Amino acid sequence: SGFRKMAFPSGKVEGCMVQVTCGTTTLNGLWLDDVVYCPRHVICTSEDMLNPNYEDLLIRKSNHNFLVQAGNVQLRVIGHSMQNCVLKLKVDTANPKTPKYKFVRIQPGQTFSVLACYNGSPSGVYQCAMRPNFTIKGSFLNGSCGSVGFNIDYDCVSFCYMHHMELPTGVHAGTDLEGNFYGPFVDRQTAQAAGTDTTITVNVLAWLYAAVINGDRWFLNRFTTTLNDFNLVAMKYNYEPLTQDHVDILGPLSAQTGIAVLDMCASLKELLQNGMNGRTILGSALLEDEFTPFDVVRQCSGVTF
Amino acid sequence: SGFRKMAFPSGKVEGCMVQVTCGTTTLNGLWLDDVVYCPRHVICTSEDMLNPNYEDLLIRKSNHNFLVQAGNVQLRVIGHSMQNCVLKLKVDTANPKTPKYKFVRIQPGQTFSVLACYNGSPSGVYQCAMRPNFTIKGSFLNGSCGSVGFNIDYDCVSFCYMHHMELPTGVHAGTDLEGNFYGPFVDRQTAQAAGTDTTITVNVLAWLYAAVINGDRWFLNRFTTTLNDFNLVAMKYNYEPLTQDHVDILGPLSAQTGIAVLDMCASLKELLQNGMNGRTILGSALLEDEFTPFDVVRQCSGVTFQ
Ligand SMILES: CC(=O)Nc1ccc(NC(=O)CN2Cc3ccc(Cl)cc3[C@H](C(=O)Nc3cncc4ccccc34)C2)cc1
Ligand SMILES: CC(=O)Nc1ccc(NC(=O)CN2Cc3ccc(Cl)cc3[C@H](C(=O)Nc3cncc4ccccc34)C2)cc1
Ligand SMILES: [Cl-]
Ligand SMILES: [Cl-]
Ligand SMILES: [Cl-]
Fold first, then answer.
1. b/e per residue, A153-184, with b = 16+ CB within 10 A?
2. Contact call for B7 and A138, based on CB within 8 A
3. Is B99 on the interface with A (CB under 8 A)?
4. For residue B148, how many other CB atoms are within 10 A of its CB?
5. Which helix (H) or strand (E) holds B273?
6. Contact yes or no for A287/A216 (Cβ under 8 A)
7. Is B6 on the interface with A (CB under 8 A)?
8. Was domain B15-99 assigned CATH 2.40.10.10?
């Protein structure tokens, strides 16, 4: 029993974290085989950030201007190139701890684990979700750029996020490992903001199934709804629309608990319209939306890596 | 910015997890140097659990009745002994991935990371706190026994908890790494309900200081309180008493934000009376008590967003 915000074990990623320094800037890099990936903004002074020409900034650098430190060992940079907003530093040593991995781009609503890092040294691990507005509600201080987000599928690390910046509301923005930003953000010092966010409906339903599995049933009711009537209510409360794909994905939880997806949607509708009336669900007074249907099934089944 | 329930990176502990089997029972063990530590109940059947005589069960076992698997490698058991509620299996191979470590027994209110494991393989990592009633609100299924709790302040792993059992209320009980239970629990199937739990007051105050550091002051008020009047109120809401030690420990967070400890106690008193009136603090609609003063200092910026 119990239900916690659980991250994947981080060991396979810890063995890839290095420190990258260019001039006065130090941030983190990810060392996989003979390449170190890091945010391309490592080559900018604060004035360059106002309007950077990364190709022009980069041509002025030699391989030796990039100092890469893996633990207490200095790695030798033997090549450099840019792919979108990521810099790829070819090194003369393949990482002996390179795990089996893939670079995957995730969709809003998907969750992942973040290994927060400073000076190439992992400091913490936590779970978060890619918001519908493409930001993440992370916990990051200056020096955390280059920290990565990942999932583990079987024995393979799927890297999905590299940290680049903090927005004025204290939320975070970054790229996939191919350097494509999530959201309409750019890697420069200019006016940027998180857009209005919404709640991830399919995840709230998954967490209500987790609560039923753990014995929290007070919110269940005799009613059902249609998908169209439920979506009219979701829009009213700034919840994402629920699709037939979301319904299909929640099928197993509907079968295990005897609570059809549209029957749980009727419970969610009543929770939105009336509140919790002093009660909590899995120790929360808010409806939690950072657990996917897969996260619920995994935590309630004990899948290992 | 931001404030998350953050665990320590689990890599150093993942390299120590093994599977221990005795007859039909398999659970997890922790392999450090040439010893594997695991719950002594690995030698029991379910029927043995009403009144097990561990000394009598153990004397009937040889070294070769214990099977230990580290990855895809079978380790050889060359000695065994029981220390309190833990079994220590001496093996013929020192763990090459043994980190720098210590065994530490923690007090209620302290937090630690749990690496949940099944069949010697890690499944996930999360943060939790030793409750005032000596239980932990973990997430554990059958087969998770032997999973450990730890902190890693400054590269040394401090192991503080080994998982033994789930109580009827769905909360968890276990031991330190010397096999001494936290709380009045025994590794026996018997009536042993946890005491009524309370809220860890010093941690709620630390988390209110985290909120101020991160830029939020809505919950503050113009008042102060004495320590005794605060305790009289707080005990009415099932909050733990705040001691002078707790006040001393909050000194650094008080200096960073400019809010006296007893002035923050007055804010907590008011929140307990009023609720949040539709507002949240660090993304929560409840008062959070599983972040210690040390955790807040570790995670938060040293510069308050004024
Ligand atoms: C309320 C408010 O105004 N807050 C605030 C004010 C200023 C900043 N940023 C800076 O001072 C300089 N940064 C500019 C910048 C531009 C573009 C790109 Cl791609 C990266 C970066 C860097 C950056 O954002 N790094 C960071 C990343 N994560 C967490 C941080 C936490 C604090 C400071 C930096 C962090 C550097 C952030 C937040
Ligand atoms: C809500 C509710 O009723 N929960 C619940 C449901 C079942 C049980 N226990 C058992 O079925 C068999 N266990 C008996 C037992 C006796 C004494 C000692 Cl020292 C250990 C053990 C084992 C044990 O507690 N292992 C476990 C550990 N952690 C998490 C578990 C989660 C489910 C099942 C086992 C777990 C084995 C306990 C609690
Ligand atoms: Cl302690
Ligand atoms: Cl009991
Ligand atoms: Cl101040």
1. eeeebbbbbbbbbbeeebbbbbbbbebebbbe
2. no
3. no
4. 25
5. helix B261-274
6. no
7. yes
8. yes
3-class DSSP state of B122: strand
| Residue pointed to by tokens 């090194």 | A91
Kind plus residue range of the DSSP H or E element containing B294: helix B293-299
Task: Domain ranges for chain A, please list them.
Answer: 1-14+100-197, 15-99, 198-301
- Interface residue B197 vs chain A (CB under 8 A): no
Question: In one letter, which amino acid is A41?
Answer: H
Contact A8 B125 (CB under 8 A): yes
Q: What angle do CA A9, B138, B279 make, to 5 degrees?
A: 95
> How many CB pairs below 8 Å do chains A and B form together?
133
DSSP for chain A, please give it: ------BPP-HHHHTTEEEEEETTEEEEEEEETTEEEEEGGGG--HHHHTS--HHHHHHT--GGGEEEEETTEEEPEEEEEEETTEEEEEESS--TTPPSEEE-PPPTT-EEEEEEEETTEEEEEEEEE--TTS-B-----TT-TT-EEEEEETTEEEEEEEEEEE-TTS-EEEE-TTSPBSSS--SSSS---PPPP-B-HHHHHHHHHHHHHTT--TT--S----HHHHHHHHHHTTBPPP-HHHHHHTHHHHHHHT--HHHHHHHHHHHHHH--TT--BTTBSS---S--HHHHHHHTTT---
**Which secondary structure element, helix H or strand E, spans residue B96, and what is its range?**
none
How many other C-beta atoms lie within 10 A of the C-beta of residue B241?
Answer: 16
How far is Cα A30 from Cα A248, in angstroms, rounded to an integer? 36
**Catalytic residue ranges of A:** 41, 145
Q: How far is CA A102 from CA A34, A48, A153, A161, A174, in A?
A: 15, 32, 10, 12, 18
**Residue ranges around ligand 2 (CB below 6 Å):** A 1; B 41, 49, 140-142, 144-145, 164-166, 168, 170, 187, 189
Experimental structure resolution, Å = 1.5
Q: To the nearest whole angstrom, how far is the Cα of A91 from the nearest Cα of chain B?
A: 24
Experimental method: X-ray
Give bridge partners of residue A90 from the DSSP assignment. A35, A79
Helix (H) / strand (E) containing B91: strand B86-91
Measured between alpha carbons, how far is A85 from A185 in angstroms, rounded to an integer?
11
Distance between the two ends of chain B, CA-based, in angstroms?
Answer: 13
Closest by CA to A176, choosing from A118, A103, A102, is A103
Rounded CA-CA distance A150/A8 in Å is 8
Q: Return the closest-CA partner of residue A82 out of A16, A185, A175, A147.
A: A175
Pairing of strands B73-75, B77-83: unpaired
Q: Which residue has the tokens 């239900």?
A: A3
* A198-301 to CATH, choices 3.40.50.1100, 2.102.10.10, 1.10.1840.10, 1.10.287.1490: 1.10.1840.10
Structure tokens at A286: 């808010």
Same fold for the pair A15-99 and A198-301: no
Active site residues of B: 41, 145
Edge-to-edge order in the sheet of strand B17-22: B73-75, B66-70, B17-22, B25-32, B35-39, B86-91, B77-83
Superfamily, domain B1-14+100-197 = Trypsin-like serine proteases (2.40.10.10)
